[PDB]
């Protein structure tokens, strides 16, 4: 049938209102929600430049 309008696939899904927005965009113009983001702190990289395996 119809997929998609002349436009991409990547916006991203709300937590309030869970409603697809750009990508680019931060806060949601739906409802007016920024998107959180969660650290979940458990260690610490003794490394800055190189990595290890
Ligand atoms: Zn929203």
């Known amino acids: 049938g119809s997929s998609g ?11 309030e209102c869970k409603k697809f927005n750009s990508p ?6 739906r409802c007016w929600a920024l998107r959180k983001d969660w650290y979940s702190d458990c260690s610490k990289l003794t490394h800055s430049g190189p990595s290890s395996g």
């Not at 309008?5 to 990547?10: L, T």
């Not at 680019?24 to 113009?29: E, T």
């Open 24 to 29: 680019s965009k931060r806060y949601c113009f």
């Open 5 to 15: 309008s002349s436009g991409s696939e990547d916006e991203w899904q709300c937590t």
